[PDB]
């Protein structure tokens, strides 16, 4: 029947550098959690150990309504083989092939890897991928102030706690329409304390966290569309005023002009997207005010992108015939320098035995996953979490 422990022999080459790793792990067939330890049998890793992620056992994955095809095919002994190709933003490719054997509740996996065309000075070969960038948790006194100011705007009474009702109030002034229950979900995500509210430290964590799919620049570039009410690509006095009024702030004509000249870095009279990104990225009364309006939008949004758990990677699985599942995902690692390094994957599962009827009817499935890696030169500790969801309207949209 179902698995409890596993091992992995993963080997092959990355840009013609051979590697070989073995180790033992465990996991839970009821919630899809796994953990694995691996060690090199063949020297120090000469490339980012992160390229082995996510490749380093869907037999641990349950479906909403019972076993997944992956478990069913373990339980009855009939098995599946796996082929995965992953294409990287910089032109590299990686192929992995997998074969499994079962002895009761223990899985032995064999994974053969081939990656090529990683640029010699890119993040893979120069060991620059990471869990969390350099910069992380480093704050100037100015950033600490801005964050305290931003907290104040949310903490309406001044009691040092956010709470659902205040987040509602602020979000309403911004012309948003969250339900009680959505407010509940937003707070819960960010409330490590468990007291059903958001204090400054939890808030500063939410503001500082590196999101898997956006770097800070990309996040700010996104917010531009919001300030630019008519989508001309410029942000004008009338638009600065609309923005300032929703954060309860006034502005004379002089105050507005100052705000423009402050962001205006080519003297034209207009604020474009590049200039708007620059003002936020920098390092006077009016500067500070604008940055706060920008960050208010960033905050709301970070609060929304936590609830529909979108720091997870989302896979789309379909069944083209009764012995095949095809899964696709978009993937991102964090670099040292604070960037995202991106790729797409396609994985094909070949089953020996025709999949049961329910699986061929309930397609696509969406599977959300989170991984973690800690590594040395010779040794990795890996963890994965997984949850499967059925199709619904606009699932196929969380996925994109």
Burial of 39 from C-beta contacts in 10 A (0-12 / 13-18 / 19+) = middle
When asked if residue 218 is in the footprint of Ca ion (CB under 5 A), the reply is no
**230 near Ca ion, judged by CB under 5 A:** yes
Query: Strands 379-390 and 365-375: what pairing?
Result: antiparallel
- Phi first, then psi: give them for residue 216, nearest 5 degrees: -65, -45
Say if residues 306 and 190 touch (Cβ distance below 8 Å). yes
| Angle, in degrees to the nearest 10, between helices 216-227 and 285-302 | 100
- Interaction between residue 386 and Ca ion (CB under 5 A): no
- Are the C-beta atoms of residues 193 and 202 closer than 8 Å to each other? yes
Closest to Ca ion by CB, 271 vs 365, is: 271
Phi-psi region of 25 (alpha: psi -120 to 50; beta: other; left: phi over 0): beta
Stretch that binds Ca ion, among 99-107, 151-159, 244-252, 361-369 (CB under 5 A): 151-159
Minimum CB separation of residue 372 from Ca ion in Å reads: 24
Decide if residue 137 touches Ca ion (CB under 5 A): no
Q: Would you say 34 or 202 has its CB closer to Ca ion?
A: 202
Strand pairing of 365-375 and 313-321?
Answer: antiparallel
Residue 201 within binding range of Ca ion, rule CB under 5 A: no
User: Should residue 384 be labelled a site residue for Ca ion when binding is judged by CB under 5 A?
Assistant: no
SS3 (DSSP) at 335: strand
- Residue 310 phi, psi (nearest 5): -110, 35
Residue with nearest beta carbon to Ca ion: 193
State the alpha helices, DSSP H only, in 155-252: 164-173, 180-190, 200-206, 216-227, 237-246
Interface with Ca ion (CB under 5 A), residue from 155, 182, 262, 384: 155
Task: Check residue 247 and report its DSSP letter.
Answer: T
Nearest residue (CB) to Ca ion, 122 versus 306: 306
Task: Tell me: does residue 266 bind Ca ion (CB under 5 A).
Answer: yes
CB of 285 to Ca ion, least distance (A): 21
Q: Which residue in the set 18, 89, 232, 321 belongs to the binding site for Ca ion (CB under 5 A)?
A: 232
Measured from the CB of residue 16, what is the shortest distance to Ca ion in angstroms? 49
Question: Exactly one of 34, 182, 191, 262 binds Ca ion (CB under 5 A); which one?
Answer: 191
262 near Ca ion (CB under 5 A): no
Task: Give SS3 for 23.
Answer: strand
Work out whether 200 is an interface residue with Ca ion (CB under 5 A): no
The yes or no reply on residue 161 touching Ca ion (CB under 5 A) is yes
Is the CB of 234 or the CB of 309 nearer to Ca ion? 234
Q: Supply the Cα-derived Rg of the chain in whole angstroms.
A: 24
Check: CB of residue 50 under 8 Å from CB of residue 335.
no
Is the CB of 218 or the CB of 232 nearer to Ca ion? Answer: 232
Residue 159 found at the interface with Ca ion (CB under 5 A):
yes
Binding residues vs Ca ion (CB under 5 A): 155, 157, 159, 161, 191, 193, 195, 197, 199, 228, 230, 232, 234, 264, 266, 268, 270
């Amino acid at each position: 029947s179902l698995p409890a422990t596993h091992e992995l022999h993963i080997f092959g080459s990355i840009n013609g550098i051979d590697f070989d790793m073995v180790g033992q792990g465990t996991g839970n067939p009821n919630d899809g959690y796994e953990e694995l330890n691996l060690k090199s049998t063949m020297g120090d890793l000469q490339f980012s150990p992160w390229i082995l992620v996510p490749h380093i056992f869907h037999q641990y994955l349950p479906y909403p309504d019972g076993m997944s095809p992956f478990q069913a095919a373990m339980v009855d002994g009939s098995g599946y083989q796996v082929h995965r190709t992953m294409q990287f933003e910089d032109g590299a490719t990686l192929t992995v092939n997998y074969r499994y054997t079962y002895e009761g509740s223990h899985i032995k996996g064999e994974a053969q890897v081939e990656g090529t065309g990683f640029p010699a000075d890119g993040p893979v070969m120069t060991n620059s991928l990471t869990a969390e960038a350099q910069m992380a948790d480093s704050l100037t006194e100015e950033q600490v102030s801005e964050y305290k100011e931003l907290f104040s705007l949310f903490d309406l009474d001044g009691d040092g706690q956010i709470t659902t009702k205040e987040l509602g109030t602020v979000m309403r002034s911004l012309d948003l329409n969250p339900s009680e229950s959505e407010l509940q979900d937003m707070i819960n995500e960010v409330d490590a304390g468990g007291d059903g509210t958001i204090d400054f430290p939890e808030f500063l964590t939410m503001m500082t966290r590196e999101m898997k799919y956006r770097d800070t620049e990309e996040e700010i570039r996104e917010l531009c569309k919001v300030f630019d009410r008519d989508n001309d690509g410029f942000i004008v006095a009338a638009e600065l005023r609309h923005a300032m009024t929703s954060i309860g702030e006034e502005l004379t004509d002089d105050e507005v002009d100052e705000m423009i000249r402050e962001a205006d870095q080519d003297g034209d009279g207009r604020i474009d997207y590049n200039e708007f990104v620059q003002l936020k990225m920098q390092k006077s009364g009016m500067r500070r005010l604008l940055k706060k309006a920008i960050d208010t939008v960033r905050a709301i949004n970070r609060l929304r992108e936590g609830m529909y758990f979108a720091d997870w990677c989302v896979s789309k699985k379909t069944c083209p015939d009764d012995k095949t599942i095809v899964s696709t995902l978009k993937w991102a690692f964090i670099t040292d320098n604070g960037k995202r390094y991106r790729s797409t994957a396609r994985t094909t599962y070949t089953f020996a035995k025709p999949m049961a009827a329910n699986y061929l009817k309930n397609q696509p499935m969406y599977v959300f996953r989170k991984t973690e890696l800690i590594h040395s030169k010779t040794e990795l500790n890996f963890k994965e979490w997984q949850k499967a969801f059925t199709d619904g309207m606009g699932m196929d949209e969380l996925y994109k």
